[PDB]
Amino acid sequence: EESRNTTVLDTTTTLQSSGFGRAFFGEAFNDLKTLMRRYQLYGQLLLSVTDIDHCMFTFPCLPQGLALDIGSAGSPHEIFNRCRDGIIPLIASGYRFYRGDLRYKIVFPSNVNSNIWVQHRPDRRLEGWSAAKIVNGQGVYNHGYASHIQITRVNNVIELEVPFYNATCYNYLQAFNASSAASSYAVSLGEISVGFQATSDDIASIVNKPVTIYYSIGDGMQFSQWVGYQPMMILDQLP
C-alpha cells in the first residue's frame, strides 16, 4: 500500500500547529479549493482581423489550462514562454476528473469602444489537445445559446459563470488525445466565442490589441480522482 507506515523512528517533539498560517496571517491555506479561485491568466491573443456577428475569437472552456501558446520564434508571449502554466493546471495535473463551474472575467483593451457579445456553446466538442486553444455555423452569432453583451464604453470587462452542462458524471482533466469519438464531449464545459460588433471601418482600430482572459473555478469544482504529478521543469534553470 502507498501511504502505509511500518516503523516510525521519530526523533521530534511536538511542533506547534499554526493552522496553515492562521496563527500568523489571520487566514487559512489548508484547503486548496479556495486557493483555486484566485484568478489566473488563461490565454492571451493579439487581434488580427483579416460582419457584425462574426465571432472574433473562440476558445474551448476548460479548467485544464489550454494548449500553451508560446508564440513564434520572434515574439513569444513572454509569460507563456518564461513562466510556465501557473497554478490551476499545476493542481489539475494532480487529478483526473473534475465536476464544476468556471469563471472568466475577460479583460478587453481600452481603445475599442464597440459592444461585445459572448456566447457559451455546450454543443461544440473538443477534438483533441491539438487546436484546443484560442482560435481567431460556428463562425457567427447564434440565437439560442446562453449569451451576454458587455458594453465596452461603460466597463471593458465581462465577468462570466460557465456552468456544468455536460451529460457526464464528470469530465476529463489531463491532456486529451481524442481517443474515442464521444469521449470528445468529456473535456470542455463548452465553447465560448467572443465577438465584437464593429463595422469594417472601425475594426481596423481594433487590430493587434491584447485581449487577456482569466479564469477560476468558483464554488462548484470537485476534482475527484487522485493521480500523481507528471515530470516538472524547474523555472530558475531556464536560460
Q: Write the CB contacts of 113 (distance below 8 Å, at least 6 apart in sequence).
A: 152, 153, 202
Among 44, 86, 135, 136, binds other proteins (CB under 8 A): 86
The reply to whether 199 sits near other proteins by the rule CB under 8 A is: yes
User: Does 68 participate in binding a copy of itself (rule CB under 8 A)?
Assistant: no
Q: Does 219 bind a copy of itself (CB under 8 A)?
A: no
Binding to a copy of itself by CB under 8 A, coded x per residue (else -) over 154-193, reads xxxx-----xxx----------------------------
Burial string for 79-95 (b: 16+ CB within 10 Å, else e) reads ebeeebbbebbebbbeb
Alpha-carbon span 219 to 36, nearest angstrom: 10
Interface residue with other proteins, options 58, 65, 193, 194 (CB under 8 A): 65
Q: Which of residues 98-137 bind a copy of itself (CB under 8 A)?
A: 107-111, 113-115, 137
Q: Check residue 4 for interaction with a copy of itself (CB under 8 A).
A: no
Scan for cell 469594417, then name that residue.
200
Other C-beta atoms closer than 10 Å to the C-beta of 232 total 10
User: 44 to 63, contacts with other proteins by CB under 8 A?
Assistant: 46, 48, 50-51
Instruction: Please state, in angstroms and rounded to a whole number, the distance separating the CA atoms of residues 186 and 178.
Output: 10
Contacts of 80 (CB under 8 A, 6+ apart): 44, 68, 69, 70, 71
* Spatial separation of the C-alpha atoms in residues 40 and 152, rounded to whole Å: 22
Stretch of 74-82, 172-180, 181-189, 223-231 lying at the interface with a copy of itself (CB under 8 A): 74-82
Binding positions for a copy of itself, rule: CB under 8 A: 25, 38-41, 44, 51-54, 75, 77-79, 82-83, 85-87, 107-111, 113-115, 137, 139-144, 146-147, 149, 151-157, 163-165, 197, 199, 201-202, 208-210, 212, 235-236
